[PDB]
Each structure stands twice: as structure tokens, then as C-alpha cells.
Design a protein around this nucleic acid. Sequence first.
RNA 1: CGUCGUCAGCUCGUGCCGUGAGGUGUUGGGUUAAGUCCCGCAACGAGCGCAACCCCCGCCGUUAGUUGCCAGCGGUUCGGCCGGGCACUCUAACGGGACUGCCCGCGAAAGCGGGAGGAAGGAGGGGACGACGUCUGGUCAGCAUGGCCCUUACGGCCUGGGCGACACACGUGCUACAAUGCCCACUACAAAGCGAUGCCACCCGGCAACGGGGAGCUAAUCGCAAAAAGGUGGGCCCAGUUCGGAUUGGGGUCUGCAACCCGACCCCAUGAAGCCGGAAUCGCUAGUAAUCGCGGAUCAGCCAUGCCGCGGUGAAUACG
Lengths: 80, 127, 98, 60, 206, 24, 155
Amino acid sequence: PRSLKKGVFVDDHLLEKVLELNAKGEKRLIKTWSRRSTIVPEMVGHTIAVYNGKQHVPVYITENMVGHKLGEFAPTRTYR
Amino acid sequence: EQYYGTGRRKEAVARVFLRPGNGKVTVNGQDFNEYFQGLVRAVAALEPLRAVDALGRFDAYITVRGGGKSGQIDAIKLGIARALVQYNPDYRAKLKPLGFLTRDARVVERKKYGKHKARRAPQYSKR
Amino acid sequence: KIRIKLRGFDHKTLDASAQKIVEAARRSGAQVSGPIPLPTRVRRFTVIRGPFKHKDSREHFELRTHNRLVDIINPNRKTIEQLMTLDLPTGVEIEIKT
Amino acid sequence: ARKALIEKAKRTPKFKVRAYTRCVRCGRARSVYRFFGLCRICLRELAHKGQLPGVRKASW
Amino acid sequence: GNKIHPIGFRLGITRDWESRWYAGKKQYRHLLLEDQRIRGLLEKELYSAGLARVDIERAADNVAVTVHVAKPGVVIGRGGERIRVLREELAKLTGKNVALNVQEVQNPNLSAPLVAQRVAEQIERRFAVRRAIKQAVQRVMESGAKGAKVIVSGRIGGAEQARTEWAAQGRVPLHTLRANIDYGFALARTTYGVLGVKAYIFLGEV
Amino acid sequence: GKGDRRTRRGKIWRGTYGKYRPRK
Amino acid sequence: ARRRRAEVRQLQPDLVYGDVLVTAFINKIMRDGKKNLAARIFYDACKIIQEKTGQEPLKVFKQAVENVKPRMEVRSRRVGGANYQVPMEVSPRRQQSLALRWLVQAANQRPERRAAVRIAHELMDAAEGKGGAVKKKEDVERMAEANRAYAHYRW
RNA sequence: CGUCGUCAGCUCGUGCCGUGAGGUGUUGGGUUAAGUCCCGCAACGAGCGCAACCCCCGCCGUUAGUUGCCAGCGGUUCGGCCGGGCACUCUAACGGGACUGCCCGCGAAAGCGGGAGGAAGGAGGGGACGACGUCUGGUCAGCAUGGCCCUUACGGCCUGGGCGACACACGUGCUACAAUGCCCACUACAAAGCGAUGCCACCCGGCAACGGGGAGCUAAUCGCAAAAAGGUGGGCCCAGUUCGGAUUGGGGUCUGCAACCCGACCCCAUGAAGCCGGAAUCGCUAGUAAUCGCGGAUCAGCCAUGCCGCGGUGAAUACG
Ligand SMILES: [K+]
Ligand SMILES: [K+]
Ligand SMILES: [Mg+2]
Ligand SMILES: [Mg+2]
Ligand SMILES: [Mg+2]
Ligand SMILES: [Mg+2]
Ligand SMILES: [Mg+2]
Ligand SMILES: [Mg+2]
Ligand SMILES: [Mg+2]
Ligand SMILES: [Mg+2]
Ligand SMILES: [Mg+2]
Ligand SMILES: [Mg+2]
Ligand SMILES: [Mg+2]
Ligand SMILES: [Mg+2]
Ligand SMILES: [Mg+2]
Ligand SMILES: [Mg+2]
Ligand SMILES: [Mg+2]
Ligand SMILES: [Mg+2]
Ligand SMILES: [Mg+2]
Ligand SMILES: [Mg+2]
Ligand SMILES: [Mg+2]
Ligand SMILES: [Mg+2]
Ligand SMILES: [Mg+2]
Ligand SMILES: [Mg+2]
Ligand SMILES: [Mg+2]
Ligand SMILES: [Mg+2]
Ligand SMILES: [Mg+2]
Ligand SMILES: [Mg+2]
Ligand SMILES: [Mg+2]
Ligand SMILES: [Mg+2]
Ligand SMILES: [Mg+2]
Ligand SMILES: [Mg+2]
Ligand SMILES: [Mg+2]
Ligand SMILES: [Mg+2]
Ligand SMILES: [Mg+2]
Ligand SMILES: [Zn+2]
């Protein structure tokens, strides 16, 4: 039962920093602190380093995860 | 012609207007039984009349506001009790002994702090 | 035919204010609607007595606001004079519409 | 109430949300009333002094 | 740690407020903060005069500040120089054309706040606490009063073991409402720490 | 019971409204 | 009750039979102060005993009660490192209490789905000398007596 | 501030007694809820506590009518709507009322039992109020404060994370295990409160949450607001079941810069444990307990089933 409304939120920090990295092909890594941002189509194929609070984690974003958030892939706590 | 009282119970007041007639009773524009739809208590309200063989010589128009049905039932009991003596002080002599003329003072006791509700105190363990 | 409102925190500051008006304009205007007592609106504050823990003590404080009406009909000429500028109560506030 | 933190007064919140109240008398953020801009402690104190007009000891 | 403020307890009767002004949920908090800010500069200034109370009446941009003191002269100044400077300092803080009456105390030995201040001072001047107390209780008892009582906190004479000195005469019924007991608290900064003075003065009843 | 959000009591208890308890 | 001896609450006569003992039984039936719901239950039962029986419900009632009152019971006590079931006579006030309580208790043990039926049957079933309410009453008396050896501990 | 504990009790002055610590008074007999009052007494009084003075509830009255009403009448779009009137109900200021005063019985008294008149009867019910002191109680993280300690960091700013981890254990609660019940209709009866960029009538759209439009109120006058338990009718028929709503999959709506960690809400699907709970243990003496719903503070929103209040229905029992 998830929901935002109308305006699939995305911090432009990386957006206009990825939609641009599309023009000159692709790239290698984009470390961000904005795990708030929603993953979107034009991200597929990229690799975003998401800060979990102590480190930036490598995340090869794929089609199957186009609707999820970035934090969802950078687990916060360390357990057993 | 007319005879008034009032009667109050658990914070519920009622206008009791007695008049010579059959036994018709209008409560907020409804038949006694129309208002007290199946509430075994009801009968009580008119008890003051039966006390003095009345009912079969009187009629009553009642207005009521505040509280709840059973509280209103009692307000009416006191109103009708007062109105009856308003029509004849000699009614006290035998109407009083049955209490009818007393206002029930007991009301919802205040909710104190530290308790769960006035008296119910919180549950404590390993004391 | 003036409608005046009298609110406050002291119930004697308003009685010595609604009558401060009526009696005056009671000899120059209509016989007035007398002072009408509008119900009060109470504001409660409940506080834990001590600074730390002890969430079972608490003390109760209320800020009750009293109200009045008066309401004199016949906005006469000799009325707005015995009144107008002869105020006294200081903890009162006044509204006027008619 | 670290002086540095009583910077709350700083309109500039960047985002209206982040703006929160604080006791105007002790800086206490944890239990401040709106109608007084005072926390439950400072409030109890001044009320006792009689410096809070109209405010009395409620009993019933 | 029991017993309520003897004043806050007596605001209904035998005791009026120190601020008489109506307000609504939109102003109250402000006219309050200010109303306080006033007592701020005031009490930090008029100290020497010996300010026992500061009533504040309001009407509408009108401020009826009434500084009560024992030495109404320290308020005024040379001819009338202070009650000019300050009276201007006030309207400077809050642009509200503020008045600023001044009253003398018919006996500063019946001003609980003062008695506290007095004793509280002697403490910083390193006096013998018990003496001060007994004395104060005397002054008050002498110049009228049906009862009186002073209380000092602890670390008396720089002692490591904080204590509490007593002293009192005549009636001082904190429980009876219609008592009319003035009360005053005086602090007491020191080379070794804080002490606390409390003054109680019982006068008349009904 | 009061814990069944798809019932009258459910809504009332949770002080909400919806299909199972619309505003009259 | 350390000071006085608590006077017994005097109840309001029945709305129908003008009986105080009825109000009691009703009260015991009642739970969560639903005196209306209570009253009805008893009454419907009265009409059920009125049908399946030719006798008047009020009288059937009285009887059952009378049959379920215990005249003896054992009250436990401490005596030199040991607890003893001391037979004790049973106070009239307490009898009526135990009787009315038991009926209702037993009644709600019955299998019949409808409340009033359960009260109905249990009540009439009681006046007949049978029923779980009466069995309790008997077990209690059997409990007492059966410890008459500890009767000298009068209490 | 908590606590012993609203438990009574803790003391002083002078006198008297004792070498002295100290004692007497405050012990004793009667009586109270009370060191409450009486009687006695080498003591006579007083202070802090009891009590009383303050608040709420219960009966009545006097000013005072933008909320009551055919009460009585004239109009009727039968809505107290309009005219009209303050009687009534209320609203809120001020007073009256109870004193063991009266009668009987018992006392020596204080008082005790009982009876009348009274709304109320012997502290009418609830609250505020908690003595000298005890716990080296609690709080240096509300604030204040002596002393120590850091002063490109033990100060300051951000972005992100954590305070929301989990094999597991306990406290306090919530919702239940059902027929004195659950569901859907229809219809009743409250009290306190809160609301001008805030309550939000009504209308339209949507299953709905909610969107769009929009009247009204500075609010006894408009809104929150439905009262729920009840009452009436109908369904379920004893089943883990039309009990119970945990968990999980979807699809949405709001607040907010932003709901992954970590929001509430709606709708569909899912439909867990649970059949009344071992040893042990908590509350409450009556409008109390038990049940039912309603408001508020904080607050954008909310993790409130928590607190703090409000009113409806309304028991059982106390030998001792
Ligand atoms: K200590
Ligand atoms: K489960
Ligand atoms: Mg209740
Ligand atoms: Mg608690
Ligand atoms: Mg708390
Ligand atoms: Mg600081
Ligand atoms: Mg905030
Ligand atoms: Mg805050
Ligand atoms: Mg269900
Ligand atoms: Mg006591
Ligand atoms: Mg002596
Ligand atoms: Mg000797
Ligand atoms: Mg000697
Ligand atoms: Mg002595
Ligand atoms: Mg002694
Ligand atoms: Mg002694
Ligand atoms: Mg002795
Ligand atoms: Mg005494
Ligand atoms: Mg005694
Ligand atoms: Mg003596
Ligand atoms: Mg310690
Ligand atoms: Mg400890
Ligand atoms: Mg320090
Ligand atoms: Mg935590
Ligand atoms: Mg673990
Ligand atoms: Mg809970
Ligand atoms: Mg629609
Ligand atoms: Mg979140
Ligand atoms: Mg199972
Ligand atoms: Mg079953
Ligand atoms: Mg008790
Ligand atoms: Mg709630
Ligand atoms: Mg909120
Ligand atoms: Mg949560
Ligand atoms: Mg809630
Ligand atoms: Zn504060």
C-alpha cells in the first residue's frame, strides 16, 4: 500500500546530473546522499553510490527496480 | 387549569405541565411510549401519579432536554411529583414518604489525575 | 439600538463595567436590555508539577473568559455622552456594533 | 538549552517544517505551550507569581 | 518537597495579579513576553532602590507600569533625571508610549520580597546566617505583622553540608486562604555557591 | 470488533470514515 | 468494613411484580450496567416459564431460589500450622446472595443458545429440585457437615 | 517534585519535677474522620498541622434577556419559522439555606441512636490544600549555581544515518476469543471543549480516503458533530465460524522540501494466534466498579491504542 500522488519526486541533484550523463554516453559511479530520490527509467544501466550513513554503496540500477527509492538498496543497519 | 414542576436528574431537566384530562402524555411531541420505546424503566416516570390514585384524572405535556433517557425518566418523575403538590399541598403528606419529592444528587464523579478515571487506579507490578 | 460586547478575565471587572455603562445611558436612552451574561469559555492547562519525571502529580490552571451584552436600543443623543469617554475598568476589552 | 540551538528564532528555516517552538523563558523545546510560548515548567512558575493575567488555580 | 506557592495559592482572594490586561490567543503570548522583558531591565536596574513589585496594567498600546519601591528617590534621580532616562528606555524596548508611576512602601519591613533581599544580601557580605534571620524576623515582627518567618537554603557559611535555617514568630497559617501572607524569594550568589532566602509576613485576615 | 477497519465500529473507533461508514 | 457494619442497600421493587428479590436477580443477570437488556432477559424467561408451565412465573422463581439456598458451608481457617474447612451456619442475607448468584451462574452453563431460555429452564428446573444450581447448593452442604469434626472451631 | 502521608501528629513560652539527659503540658476516662470536642490533671496558654475561610455538584430566590416557548395567543414555506412575551429551561453574578437548631431516648459532658420538617441531616458528594521531619530520594539534560575539565575542539554548520536494530525477558495497555454476541439498516437521548488563512454547512466528482466549488461564523447566534451503548426491523445458528482482525500482495489518497530506513488514512485481495489463560498478581465500597462514546493539550502530519477531562447506562459485597 505505497503512495506519493502526482509528481514522482526526484532530487534534481543527480537527475539533471544523469539525464545529462546520457548525452555523452554513460559513466562510472555517481555518489549521492539523496536516497530520498525515486529511481526512474533513464537511470537504468547506471551505477549510483548511495550513502547509507557511513558509506556510499554501489547500486547497479536495473529495469526490475525502476519504481523503487534509492535508499531501498542501501541498507542502514548492520545485523548479526 | 395548569400545574408546573421541573425535576432534574443526573444533569437532565424536564418541563412538567399537568392538566385535567385522560392520561395522555406528550413528551417532546411524542407519546410517552413513543419516546420511551421499549425501556422497561419508563413506567417509573409516571409512578408519582399512581401514588395518589391520579393518572385517572390528569393529563401531562412534558418537555425534556439534557442528559440521557433514564436520567430524563427521573427528571419527569420529580417534575410530575412537584406539579402534583402544585395542584394540592395535601399530596405531600403521602407523596413525600415515597421520596418522590427528593432530587437525586449523585452525579458523575470527577476524573482525577494519576487515576484511570476518578477511582480506578493504574495497575502496578513487582512492588 | 447599539450592540456592545464585554469580554474579560475578571468577572467583577466586567460587572463594574457593564453597569458602568447601563446606569449612565439609563437616563438618556431606551431602558436598555439590561446586562446579559453570556456563557464563559474556560481554557485549561494541566502541568506535571515537578521538572523531571513524576508524571502523576500535575496541577490544574484555567483562564476563564467572561462575557456580557447590555444592548441599548434607541441610539439617542444624550446617551453617547453619559458614556462615550468615562471608562474605568482596565482588565476589560470592548467591541461595538449596532 | 544550548545558546547555539536557541537559533530556532531564526526565521530562515529553509523549509517551513523544520521551524519549531521553544520556551521563550528557558529555551525548553520539549513541552512548550502555544498560548504562552512557555514550557510547562516556566508556565507553572510565572502562574504562581501571578504574572500570567487571568490564569488561576483550577479546582472542581 | 511539598507545599504550594503562598501567593499563587491566594490569587483568588487575599492577593491580586501583577499584570492586569485582557488579550486573545493571538496577542497574549506577546504582551506577555514583553511584559516580562520589562521586569527584565527594571529588576536589573532599580535593584538598589529596592523594587518590591511591578504591576502592569494595559489598555491598548497603553502601559501602566507601576514600580513599587522603598526608596522612590533612586527611581526619580536628580530633579527627575532617571524617571526620564528609563521611562525612555522602556518606550525604546517597546514602542508603546509607556507611563511609569512610582510608589513608596509604607514600611519596607513588611515587604516580604525586600526582607528576603535584605537577608539575601547580608549572606553575600558574609554575615552569620542565623543572626540575620532572627534579626529579620524581628524587624518584621516589630513593625507590625501578626507573624513572620524566614528560611535560608544550604551551604551556610560555605559548609560542604547544605542545611536549612529556620526562625519565625506569631501566626503564619499557610493553609488558611484569607491569610494575606506576603511572600518573597531572594537568591544569593557566592564564592562557593547559591543559597536561597524565603520571606513570609502574615498580616490581617477576613 | 473495534479492530476491524472494514466495519462500522472499526471506523468509529479509528475515528475515520469511508465506504463502511460514510458521512451520512 | 473496619468501623461500621455497612447497612444493606435497599433495592427498588420490581417494575412488574413489585418485588425487590426480582430486581436483585435482574442485577445479577446484568453485566456492564445493561439493566435494560438484563430486565428483558428475565421477563422473556418469565413468559417462557408461563408457557411450558401452568404455574405463575413469580411463584416458580421464589421456589427455585428457596431450593438453591445453602444452610451450611465450610469456611477455611488457620490453626497451628494447618488450614481447616470449618462448617459454619449460613447467614440469611448470604443465602439469598449465594442462591441468586448460583442460579445465574448455573443458568449460563446450560446448552440452550438463548439467554432467557437458559434462565427460564434453570429457574423452573430448579423449583423441580434438579438443576446445577441446586447441585452446587448440595455440594456445599455436603462439604460442610462432612467436616463436622472441625465444628468445635465455632469461629 | 516524589515518598512515609491528608497519616493525625510535631513543637514552643512561662511555671512545676529531676544532679542530668529530660519530664510534665501532648498522659488518663468519654468521643471524633482528626492532638475533634468533653471531663479530669502541676500546669496555664500558644505555634506549625485538623478543621474553617476558596472552587465544583445538589434546592430556592433577585436581575438580566439575540440561547429557551403555542407556557398563552396571532400568523405556518408546521422550521420556535415570524410577530410577540419573559413565565419556564438555561446562561452567570450576587444571596438564601443546615445549626444536632426541633422532638424522643442515653449521657455528666462532648456527643451517640432514633423521629419530623426539609433538595439536602449531622464532615450532603467531589476538589484545592499535604505539619517538625525521613529517604546523602529525583533532577547539573527546563532553568539557576560553587568547583573541576575542552577551548581549529568536549564549541559551531550541514547532508545522511541512529534514537524505530533483534535469538530473548518483564512492566503498562489495546483488540479479542463471541449468541447477555457480531453485521446491515431505521430511529432516539449528552456534557464538556476547540475553531479567521481555522473549524468547515451545502453541492458536484470519486466505492472511499479525499479532490473542486462554496454559504457561514471575530462564534449561547456558524462549524467540528455522527453520540454509542440503546430502541425497532432484518440477517448469521454454534462453526474458529457473518467470531477475531494479526500478517502479507496490490492499487490510491493526504501532510510535507522529502514518507527506503521510518507517517497516518482509504479500497480489493489475504484472513494469523486466539475457545477465557500455570505459579502468581492488580483495581474498586457506590453514580463507585464495569461498560459506551465525545473533546482537548502537543501538533504540518503522525506511529495516541498514552495522558488530561466530559457525559450515557449502571452492579455486586462488607459477617467480621
Ligand atoms: K540528600
Ligand atoms: K498469529
Ligand atoms: Mg464514566
Ligand atoms: Mg501512567
Ligand atoms: Mg505523563
Ligand atoms: Mg545553557
Ligand atoms: Mg515540528
Ligand atoms: Mg515544541
Ligand atoms: Mg468482523
Ligand atoms: Mg484527615
Ligand atoms: Mg517547660
Ligand atoms: Mg531520676
Ligand atoms: Mg532544676
Ligand atoms: Mg519540655
Ligand atoms: Mg508528647
Ligand atoms: Mg512530653
Ligand atoms: Mg506521658
Ligand atoms: Mg488542634
Ligand atoms: Mg484521639
Ligand atoms: Mg491536660
Ligand atoms: Mg544520591
Ligand atoms: Mg534512587
Ligand atoms: Mg554545575
Ligand atoms: Mg525511544
Ligand atoms: Mg539480538
Ligand atoms: Mg497500549
Ligand atoms: Mg459520490
Ligand atoms: Mg517515514
Ligand atoms: Mg487454533
Ligand atoms: Mg466457539
Ligand atoms: Mg475508600
Ligand atoms: Mg480521543
Ligand atoms: Mg494532532
Ligand atoms: Mg508505527
Ligand atoms: Mg486519539
Ligand atoms: Zn519554560
